[PDB]
Amino acid sequence: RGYDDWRLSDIPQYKDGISTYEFVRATHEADYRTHQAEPVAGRTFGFNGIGRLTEVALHMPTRYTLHDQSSQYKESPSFFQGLMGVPDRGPVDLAAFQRETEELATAFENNGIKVHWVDYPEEPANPYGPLMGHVFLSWGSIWRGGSVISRFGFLPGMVGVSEYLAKWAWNTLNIPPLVAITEGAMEPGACNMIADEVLVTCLSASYDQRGTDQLVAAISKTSGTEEFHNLQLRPAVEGFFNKATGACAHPDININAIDVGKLVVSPAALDWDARTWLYDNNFELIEADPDEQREFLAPCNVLLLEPGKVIAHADCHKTNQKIRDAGVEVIEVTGTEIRKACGGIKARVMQINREPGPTLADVRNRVWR
Amino acid sequence: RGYDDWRLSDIPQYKDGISTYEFVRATHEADYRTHQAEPVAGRTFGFNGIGRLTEVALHMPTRYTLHDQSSQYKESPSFFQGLMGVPDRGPVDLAAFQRETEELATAFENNGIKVHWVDYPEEPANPYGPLMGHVFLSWGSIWRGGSVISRFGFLPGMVGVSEYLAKWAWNTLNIPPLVAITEGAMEPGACNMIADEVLVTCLSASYDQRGTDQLVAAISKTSGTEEFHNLQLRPAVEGFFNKATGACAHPDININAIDVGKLVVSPAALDWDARTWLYDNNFELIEADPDEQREFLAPCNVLLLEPGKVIAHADCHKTNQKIRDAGVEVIEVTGTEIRKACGGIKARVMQINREPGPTLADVRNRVWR
Amino acid sequence: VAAISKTSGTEEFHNLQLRPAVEGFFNKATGACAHPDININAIDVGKLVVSPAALDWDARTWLYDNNFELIEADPDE
Ligand SMILES: [Cl-]
Ligand SMILES: [Cl-]
Ligand SMILES: [Cl-]
Ligand SMILES: [Cl-]
Ligand code: NA
Ligand code: NA
């Protein structure tokens, strides 16, 4: 469009004869997401909801991606094994890690999903040490309305990283920031949605109430939904993972949607209030295998491509069969090296764009019981 | 610092023998600004308060900087003259505009203040037309805690511009975003502070309550102050400026600190509640000349370099004498071309860094009446 | 307002409150005034004569929402 060709008709709130007051008022009333954020970006964006995923980012590991090679980990493996709490499965194997990364990318390509690649500097560091956990790009997933700078609860190696990913998203995709979390703890990228307007959080090492309130207030205003609901799990876990029980600080390890009103769910996830809410709202629960969960095979860390189709860890045999039994297609992907730190396959995927999908009303209206 | 030289002692919350819970809790308790935002940026930043200004940005005008040369202005001068409401003083003169820009920069340099320069693309445009008002870099001033994406109330030509300036600040200065305003209207960069923890807003074309609440909640958490106060003016004005009265939608045209508990103030600014609050809190008021105000010479659009020293428009002779009479040094700078649109000298300065300065308690404790 | 609302002979009673920028009775720099009767007055059903120094944004919004037509007084007068 030519620079001298612009006319008043190109301003949506303009109309012939409008008064100053009326024009200003119309401007105050405009929707941020659809008037400002998306037009200025030149595109739609946000991973909210349970609709069709179209666009993600992965990190291809280098030696610096390996948590067990940080000088601080070498100084005290037990300090980090406390924070993370995941079972010890041996040193990370860089080459096998690279191979399961390729395998995941091929699965995305075979399912029509665009994959961006994120690289970090050589010898990447924040003010407090080598980066750690920076393979887990879910921590930088993009919301309707924009990116988020997180307050990490347990992993100091992620300081600087949500900034890096949000800046990457702005420079590479033109996607703006929505909010920085500035109190408590909130790691929104490890949360998941079970309907278009329903968010699952935890109260845990990774989330306190003040952090949660700050995040939810920001994303609810750009959610593109009339209502916004937060289901809050209350897992019994000190750090990230409780290897005695399978309980986890992160929603994405506790629960995930597999279809409209169908969830895969950990045995260590649901307190009575959470169970009641899910019952009242007509959600069908597929319980993950208890051993797969407790051993941290991440059977609930599935990535919903669209209602009825998920990527899952190939060795979660029992949970995956239960998912298929519930009518859901499973794309099996190797995910073993990734689980030597605090996450699985879904945890390592930065979600950029998911198309609007089924609503809580849809879930409530499904006749199944 | 070497990549393999990092130790646990370099994590502030770490100490020998700390439990997982205790380490996580210490991390949840850390101050965002001083633990995360500033260390990750590698510097301090924010224009909050009335302390010593050290760092700003200006825009050197090109033909595209001129509001009266937008194709939309050419289509209807009266539409934009409605929105802005400033007196017609003739076409903007590009060369004279460039010269008063140089003069302002020289004043900064002579006062030990670093000046960055911001350029826009050729033929700069947002989704709704040519940029307009983008010389007014105050709209991108940086807060303690980070940058802000604004919701402009009256000027569609500024859509995209607060984004551009915040992205510039991140890429050029490594200064992160704090928040996007996503409801109503809020133009925080045109607000001013009259003590370290006291912000002046308006309710006007440029600010509604919902926008205000969103902004204040965000900046109060990173303010670095125990309390945070918002004085809210209620000017009688439809657009930006009321040429019958001198009333203005923007705080920076209504009022500004010139020293500790000394303010320059428009005759059209103070309703009874605002007057009462200022009286109770021991603020001395220097009233701007009524004619200078009403004619939009911007006598309150002074820039505080530090308590007791301001830059002011050279032709605000009467207001400037009153400022000198109140013991304040005035640096007179030409500012005539700038005032053909919605702002003066302070309005065109992006403030990046101001050192912490006097508090509300300081103001209250000054003995003067 | 509490006293006059009880004898108003009306189901509801509303108070629109202007917030003029004036120290005493009158601000000769602006035309702002401490008294409503100098700021605004009805001239017909939902038609008001109104000073340029009278209406803050909230007052303007309320009058707009309630369908009042504003005739602006001459600024010099
Ligand atoms: Cl109107
Ligand atoms: Cl768009
Ligand atoms: Cl403890
Ligand atoms: Cl620092
Ligand atoms: Na916020
Ligand atoms: Na009485």
Residue numbers in the entry:
A (entry chain A), B (entry chain A): 11 to 379
C (entry chain A): 226 to 302
Please, what does the article write about this entry?
Mycobacterium sp. JS330 produces 2-nitroimidazole nitrohydrolase (NnhA) that circumvents 2NI activation, conferring 2NI resistance by hydrolysing it to nitrite and imidazol-2-one (IM2O) instead. Despite low sequence similarity and limited occurrence in a few soil-dwelling mycobacteria and Actinomycetota, NnhA maintains the α/β propeller fold characteristic of GME superfamily enzymes and forms an unusual hexameric ring structure formed by a trimer of domain-swapped dimers. The residues in the active site of NnhA appear somewhat conserved in comparison to the ADI and DDAH, with the catalytic histidine, glutamic acid, and cysteine residues present in NnhA as H260, E197, and C357.
We also crystallized and solved the structure of an active site variant NnhA-T2I-G14D-K73R-C357A, in which the presumptive nucleophilic cysteine residue had been substituted for an alanine residue. To investigate which of these cysteine residues is likely to be the catalytic nucleophile for the reaction, we substituted either C352 or C357 for either alanine or serine residues in addition to the T2I, G14D, and K73R mutations. We found that despite soluble expression, C357A and C357S substitutions eliminated activity. This suggests that of these two cysteine residues, C357 is more likely to be the nucleophile in NnhA, fulfilling a similar role to the nucleophilic cysteine in ADI and DDAH that are conserved in the same structural position. While D262 exists in two rotomeric conformations in soluble NnhA, only one conformation with a slight displacement is seen in the structure of the C357A mutant of soluble NnhA.
